[PDB]
């Protein structure tokens, strides 16, 4: 075989050629914080926030996108990388709005969560933030933009894994916005998997909206009936009711979506 | 002097403190010869019991030997010489330098599991 | 007359605390240790405050610590005086408790005036305190120490000299200092018996290396010494109480780390990361990280100890309270052999027992 | 000696106090608990959990509040082998069906794929 | 506004009314259904709409650290107001 | 404090103190019921430089324990600390 | 560091010997006490005359729960249920929908008063200061379930007590 | 990392330590673990043959003098096959330290009473028997001490739920308290509460 | 008022005797208070 | 496979152990029936013990057996010197607690419970 040697925090591991960074820290089972990357799509490098040190090397490298070279030591709990994460952080919660009590995706927020983990506790931020416009793509996907952090998985997923090529980022700079430029309607059979892989609250679940909060919800891992597919899902369930329906990653049917109709 | 309580409630004045200790430490190390000498417990506390030995003969007086002996009262030294006695006589009969009776499993220590 | 043998039975007011805190957050586990000794509140939150935070391997501010050994002594005098008025309420001395009970009531309103609530503040927490002091309540505490040594005085003059209040304590509940080391004793029942142990001298925690205060030491291990040991140690927390209103330090009342203590409202309100923590910490609650302590601390009753165990998650593992009443309790069959039915009733007494921190 | 010899199966049913209806008649369940896909984090899925069926959950007619009859409801078991948990389940004689771990298997990134020059995994947008 | 039911019973402000058939109506009997007459989706709707003069606005509801955390809302559609999440004061850009 | 001084001298005879000097009835001496507003102090992580939040980590420096001894000359004999130093009798009141 | 309590040696001189049998004959302590208490009964009692007098309460005061409201009418609780998450004893049900105009807003607001320890953990978790604990402590009730408040009853002690919970929200608010 | 981090005591950290080689090597017949936490507390993990020697010696030996058992306790920790952890917290008044006595069975095999050694140890190892089901063998007066007295069942078992199986309830029938089967008017609400990211990478565990 | 009079005798209210319909002259109510008097009269407050 | 005992060996010393323990509780049930006072028969109370013994007469570990030993003993302490009450003592005799349904088809017909 081929596989090179590659050091994470000292620790061997040996990885294919072709292997991110990312993936080479997953292997030694650490998980670095991500925003933009998603195994199932394709890589965009832009949120910053893999920004690992590989040792004898003076800069940060996007592990998200960078393949691995023999003979790195990657640094997944030094100081300048634990400082990028801080100042990445910082500068993805500049703009974001105060919403996390009205904001569906509280509890189950990766920013939340890895703000927690990863970020600074206070905000030097003493300016106005930002206010996106919301937009109406659907009955199913409530859009409250200003909660966007521009990862880019919706117009990857509905790019790559949905197939129509509708979404997309509109302007420029710190006005730039994820939208279809026109009241149009992202209506696929797809279009509620972009309220899973949306790491924050700008795509929630319009039915799903308000009615439930994550903590409290009960997990039920079942199967749908609604297609002959046999789509794996979790039916969360608060005091004798149903929620809602997400999906079980399962590597061999639905890899980790559902339809509109199961959800 | 004639020290008219210890303080301590239950513990009686000891009269002959400097003969009460030499007494309790030469029983104990002759309770203590009866250990193998590549035993631990018998070359420390043939150490330390030595120290306190040479301690108390080396001293005439009572509250000298208790400030340098650092234990408190000395009746309360004679309480641990006993207790001492009392260990090395337990200690032969459970033979607690040979080597570990059983493993443990494998995650039986591992925290968080 | 003779007592030949006293079982206690116990475990009536058994409510499975440390069940219940296995299944809470850390911050939700705070108000369990108010109800263990609900005469003694804020020195067991202190207790498993002490615990979270040496976990957590954070400390609280300096005034937080002031603040913590003030409400700590002001605890101790509330215990204390509970101690003696139903140690002579029981034997049949009813007029101390009316006339102490005054000067608890306004702790009680010290406690009010700090928290919100009389007895259960669930105000000393992991990081701090909850809330600063309002501003003119450090001199209503001095107004208070200014003048309850002459309440201690007057309690004194009625028990200490009196000849039927000796008959009841004197040749009763004589415990020897092996036996009471034996026992695990802690507190008046070591200190009694003339054991020179006191767990703020010996193991010092929050800022009880920077006071100066006494430790008394009884002579004949029985009720009555352990009965002016208690005296004593009122006396001492009133020392202690004025050192701790003149030294007391301007300055922040949480840590400053937001990832454990929740941030001020007028910040959550208008910082981003300040109200993803407020979110965070009053849903989920912050992470411990693994391993196990034992922190204890000197309550009023003895020795208070939390034995806690965390698994890397918001909530407990295991949280086992010692107590120090359980051990009393235990050595009750001993310490009332030879004894009669009624030295029963004072042998109860001078081990000061709150049946919630005997039972959980 | 000082040691005996027992060849029997391990059962402590009649220990544990638990009545012969939550013994008999309920399904345990051995899984790894599935990632919510809210989110990235892999973190809860790495031990193993042991629940119990789901039983009725009715409404009060006071309050509306969902009652129970269900004991074991609330009991979630945290194991850290599978072989653990089955080990559990079959010494307090608990029906149980196992599921196995479901991790995910290495994806194939290549920052270049996106930018081709004759397939078709080319974005349109970046 | 309260409304009443055709069995007599006020309608909450969720819309919770009993049923005609339903017995839970007898908790109700010979006591009263405490209901509250201040309906909060009729009393927003009673505030005017703040005319300003800026594209985007802050809302914090008044009274600082009394309010509710201090949130920005875009006014770019001029069909809709802007509408806070928190407070229900909705905004309109005056030109 | 609305006492006589006929009352008044008989109690402080009766007690053998002098009561109204400490009463235990609180009067105007007490603290306002309101107070002015105050201003608290910020903590030392209120700074806009030199604070990151990784060089203030307290709970990411808490470290698994260090195993000593596990099962996979002539020195001196230890103590877990050493020994108590004894305690000084009270140089504010002994009772002696 | 230390004292003796009970370490007096008694002198054996003939005046102490006498002081003592005078003490025990005479019963010098025991008119000590008869002194003491003869001294507490003419002292004013501390004897408030409730219900028409009332005991000093600080406004930080824990009692009855309430939900507020904006100086507009609008009701503060947008269902964030931060508040039964915190709860300690899980006294709080929530249950939430957008009602007719889009708001985030709760039909369901249960607080069990028989389950709550009032510790105001809902009060300072409350992101909006839409549940507050009021200075309402006499509240006692006939029935086991009139304790049992729902949105309706928590919205009337709201409108109940706002004129005074402004107030000590006013007075202590900067500590928080 | 003034202000607001701990500050670590290595004096007693190291002192701790050679403490723990000391008693590590005394009695090599039971201890099998000794570790030191970062807040410096010393853990003995022992043997459970070993209960009475390791424990006699820390309260006779003359450099131990553990002479006060302070807490006993037991953890249940179900997915060890010795499921059950016995822990000894000591404390020593002559060298002012804390030791920690740590130790394990499963439900079946018996730990051996330490009354013999301190007798604080009477309720509380009854308590860890009325609690967890753990047998201690040569007891005095062995029974339980909290529960109910027709109590089945061991409550601090973590295969035991919240609430029990059985409640309370007046019976004016037979004018009697009758214990009937548990029905909650409102369910104990799980809450789903550990974050999917990891908080600690120090204590990250190795995978498979 | 009478401030000559200890903390917690220096203020009082003699209840009306008819609120809401009720005779309350002899049943005096704790909670017949209004709540913009339960800050002066619990002393929350120094200002009526 | 080699366990450490608890009292017996083998099966048999078991046996012994639940054969004493059985004497003693047919001892007890006269005295259990006339010093609490109860409403129920000797032979009620002794049709109750045989029946507490054969819900776990399957048993074929010696530990298990030892322990169930062990807790009867506790149990007849508990019930010779007064510590339990009546309602205790009662709690056996499952009186206030309506019959469960036994076959399919009233299962099936009050409600999901297998
Ligand atoms: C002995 C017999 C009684 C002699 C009078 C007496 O001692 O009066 C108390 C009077 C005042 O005592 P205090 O309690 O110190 O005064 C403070 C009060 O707050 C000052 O009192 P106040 O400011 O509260 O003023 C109001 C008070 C005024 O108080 C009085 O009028 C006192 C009662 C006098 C009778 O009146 C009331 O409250 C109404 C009480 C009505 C019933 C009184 C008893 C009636 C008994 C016969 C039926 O005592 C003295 O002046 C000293 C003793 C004089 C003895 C004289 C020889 C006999
Ligand atoms: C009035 C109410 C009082 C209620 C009293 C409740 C008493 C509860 C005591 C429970 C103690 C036990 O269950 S120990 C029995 C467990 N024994 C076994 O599993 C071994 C199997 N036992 C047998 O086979 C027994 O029939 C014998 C008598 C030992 C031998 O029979 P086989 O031979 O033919
Ligand atoms: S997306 Fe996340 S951080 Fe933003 S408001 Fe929602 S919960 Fe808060
Ligand atoms: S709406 Fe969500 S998924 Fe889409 S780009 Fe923004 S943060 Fe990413
Ligand atoms: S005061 Fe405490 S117990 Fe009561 S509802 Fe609020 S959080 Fe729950
Ligand atoms: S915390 Fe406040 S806003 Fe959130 S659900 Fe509770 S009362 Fe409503
Ligand atoms: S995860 Fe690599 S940059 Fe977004
Ligand atoms: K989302
Ligand atoms: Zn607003």
Known sequence: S?????????????????????????????????????????????????????????????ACAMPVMKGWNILTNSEKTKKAREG?????????????????????????????????????????????????????????????????????????????????????????????????????????????????????????????????????????????????????????????ILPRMHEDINEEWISDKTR | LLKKTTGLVGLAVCETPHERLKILYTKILDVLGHIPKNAAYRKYTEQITNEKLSIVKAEPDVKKLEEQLQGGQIEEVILQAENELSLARKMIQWKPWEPLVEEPPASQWKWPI | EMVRKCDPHIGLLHRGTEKLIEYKTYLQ?????????????????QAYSLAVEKLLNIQPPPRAQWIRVLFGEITRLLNHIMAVTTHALDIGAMTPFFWMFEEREKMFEFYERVSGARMHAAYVRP?????????????????????????????????????????????????????????????????????????????????????????????????????????????????????????????????????????????????????????????????????????????????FGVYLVSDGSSRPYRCKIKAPGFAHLAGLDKMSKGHMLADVVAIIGTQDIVFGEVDR | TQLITVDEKLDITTLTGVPEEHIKTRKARIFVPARNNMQSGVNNTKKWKMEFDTRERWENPLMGWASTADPLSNLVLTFSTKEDAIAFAEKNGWSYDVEERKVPKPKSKSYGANFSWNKRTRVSTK | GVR?????????????????????????????????????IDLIAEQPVSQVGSRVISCDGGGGALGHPRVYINLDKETKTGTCGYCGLQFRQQH | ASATRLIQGLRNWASGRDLQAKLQLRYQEISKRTQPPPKLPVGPSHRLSNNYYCARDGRREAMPPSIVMSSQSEKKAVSPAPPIKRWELSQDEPYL | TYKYVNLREPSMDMKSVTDRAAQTLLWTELIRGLGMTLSYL???????????????????????????????????????????????????????????????????????????????????????????????????????????????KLLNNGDKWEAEIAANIQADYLYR | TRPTVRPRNDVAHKQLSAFGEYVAEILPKYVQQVQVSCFSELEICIHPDGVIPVLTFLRDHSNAQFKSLADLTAVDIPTRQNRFE???????????????????????????????????????????????????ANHPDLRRILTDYGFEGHPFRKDFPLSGYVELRYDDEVKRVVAEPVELAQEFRKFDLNSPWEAFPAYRQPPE | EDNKQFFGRHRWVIYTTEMNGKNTFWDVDGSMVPPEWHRWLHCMTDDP | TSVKPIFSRDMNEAKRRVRELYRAWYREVPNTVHLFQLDISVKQGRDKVREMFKKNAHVTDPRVVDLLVIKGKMELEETINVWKQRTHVMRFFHETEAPRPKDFLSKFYVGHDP
């Open chain 3, 127 to 303: 990081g701090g305190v909850h809330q600063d002091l309002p501003l003119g309540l450090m001199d209503d505490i001095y107004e208070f120490s200014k003048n309850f040594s002459l309440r201690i005085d007057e309690l004194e003059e009625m028990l200490t000299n009196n000849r039927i209040w000796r008959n009841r304590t004197v040749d009763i509940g004589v415990v020897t200092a092996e036996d009471a080391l034996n026992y695990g004793f802690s507190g008046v029942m070591l200190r009694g018996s003339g054991i020179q142990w006191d767990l703020r001298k010996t193991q010092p925690y929050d800022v009880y290396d920077q006071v100066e205060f006494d430790v008394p030491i009884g002579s004949r291990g029985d009720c009555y010494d352990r009965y002016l040991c208690r005296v004593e140690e009122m006396r001492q927390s009133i020392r202690i109480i004025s050192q701790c209103l003149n030294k007391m330090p301007p300055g922040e009342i949480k840590v400053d780390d937001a990832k454990v203590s929740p941030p001020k409202r007028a910040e959550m309100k208008t910082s981003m990361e300040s109200l993803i923590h407020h979110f965070k910490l009053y849903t989920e609650g912050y992470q411990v990280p693994p391993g196990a302590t034992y922190t204890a601390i000197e309550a009023p009753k003895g020795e």
């Open chain 3, 29 to 45: 586990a705070l108000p369990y240790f108010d109800r263990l000794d609900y005469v003694s509140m804020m020195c067991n939150e």
């Open chain 1, 88 to 244: 990445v952080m910082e500068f993805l919660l500049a703009n974001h709005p105060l919403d996390c009590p009205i904001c569906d995706q509280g509890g189950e927020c990766d920013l939340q969560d890895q703000s927690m983990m990863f970020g600074s506790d206070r905000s030097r931020f003493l300016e106005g933030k930002r206010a996106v416009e919301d937009k109406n793509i659907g009955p199913l996907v409530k859009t409250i933009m200003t909660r966007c952090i521009q990862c880019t998985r919706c117009i990857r997923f509905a790019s790559e894994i949905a197939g129509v090529d509708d979404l997309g980022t509109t302007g420029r700079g710190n006005d730039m916005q994820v939208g279809t430029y026109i009241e149009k309607m992202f209506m696929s059979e797809l279009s509620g998997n972009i309220i899973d892989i949306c790491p924050v609250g700008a795509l929630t679940s319009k039915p799903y909206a308000f009615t439930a909060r994550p903590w409290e919800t009960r997990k039920t891992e079942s199967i749908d009936v609604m297609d002959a597919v046999g789509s794996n899902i979790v039916v969360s369930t608060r005091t004798g009711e149903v929620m809602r």
């Open chain 5, 4 to 40: 009443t039911s055709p069995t007599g019973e006020k309608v909450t402000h969720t819309g919770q009314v009993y049923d005609d058939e339903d017995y839970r109506r007898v908790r109700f009997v010979g006591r009263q259904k405490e209901v509250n007459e201040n309906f909060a």
């Open chain 7, 42 to 152: 003419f002292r004013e009692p501390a004897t408030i005359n409730y219900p028409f007098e009332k005991g000093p309460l600080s406004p930080r005061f824990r009692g009855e729960h309430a939900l507020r409201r904006y100086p507009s009418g609008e009701e503060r609780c947008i269902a964030c249920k931060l508040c039964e998450a915190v709860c300690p004893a899980q006294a709080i049900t929530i249950e939430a929908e957008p009602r007719a105009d889009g708001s985030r807003r709760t039909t369901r607001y249960d607080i069990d008063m028989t389950k709550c320890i009032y510790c105001g953990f809902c009060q300072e978790a409350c992101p909006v200061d839409a549940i507050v604990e009021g200075p309402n402590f006499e509240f006692s009730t006939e029935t086991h379930e009139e304790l049992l408040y729902n949105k309706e």
């Open chain 8, 86 to 136: 016995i822990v000894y917290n000591l404390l020593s008044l002559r060298f002012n330290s804390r030791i920690r006595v740590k130790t394990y069975t499963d439900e079946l095999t018996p730990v051996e009473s330490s009354v013999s050694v301190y007798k604080a140890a009477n309720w509380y190892e009854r308590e860890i028997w009325d609690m967890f089901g753990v047998f201690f």
């Open chain 1, 2 to 62: 081929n596989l090179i040697e590659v050091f994470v925090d000292g620790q061997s591991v040996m990885v294919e050629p072709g292997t991110t960074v990312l993936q080479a820290c997953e292997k030694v089972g650490m998980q670095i914080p991500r925003f933009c990357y998603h195994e199932r799509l394709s890589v965009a490098g832009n949120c910053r926030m893999c920004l690992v040190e590989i040792e004898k090397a003076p800069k940060v490298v996007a």
